[PDB]
Amino acid sequence: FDFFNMENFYAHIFNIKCARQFEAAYPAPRGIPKGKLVKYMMGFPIIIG
Amino acid sequence: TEAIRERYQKQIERGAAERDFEPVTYGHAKRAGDYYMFKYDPENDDLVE
Amino acid sequence: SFLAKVFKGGVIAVYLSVILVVGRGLVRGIFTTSPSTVMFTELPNADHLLKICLDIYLVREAKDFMLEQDLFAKLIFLFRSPATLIEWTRMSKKKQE
């Protein structure tokens, strides 16, 4: 059971760190609102699905 | 109500020393919580004389 | 008689029963986030816990089970007291250093 707990902790830490790196790998102006394209390139799909 | 809201944000956030903030990548400054902006009682504000 | 029709009401029940579980559970979890799982899911810099997670395996490879057991309590305590977790996962400083 301690083995399983340790593996779960490792998976969680790995996912968090890697998500931080992927978010940091793409700079993004801190302020300008979301572009019209981006929005229709993300929101639209969801609604249809 | 928006004007009085902004100044307090400045007050304590600056009485502090911080540790370098807000690089230009949205979604990072949302995780800048700390103990220095909760050093005031929520009702201990004498707006009226 | 193409499959005739089993009580359409019952069909609708199941037809909704499925629509329910999926959204009321899976979709909810995927879109949204529990008020409890905020202290863990978002961390400014998760590079110090990964060091311990790799180091325990590294010790495990080279025997030395004493260090292997003494470094699991150190990890289990970080998920107990949120103050130490917040202190340890704070973002690093060499940039302005």
Method in brief: cryo-EM
Q: State the Cα–Cα distance between residues A3 and C76, nearest whole angstrom.
A: 12
| Tokens representing residue B40 in the block | 């005031």
For chain B, what percentages of helix, strand and coil (3-state, to nearest 5) are there? 35, 0, 65
Chain C CB within 8 Å of residue B31 CB: yes
| Tokens representing residue A16 in the block | 């968090």
From chain C, pick out residues whose CB is under 8 angstroms from the CB of A6: 53, 56, 72, 75
Query: B39 with B12: CB under 8 angstroms?
Result: yes
Chain B CB within 8 Å of residue C44 CB: yes
Residue recorded with tokens 């029709």: C5
List b or e across B14-29, with b for residues whose CB sees 16 or more CB atoms inside 10 angstroms.
Answer: eeeeeeeeeeeeeebe
Q: State the Cα–Cα distance between residues C86 and C81, nearest whole angstrom.
A: 9
Nearest Cα of chain C lies from the Cα of B13 at a distance, in angstroms, of: 18
Chain A's closest residue to C47, CA to CA, is A17
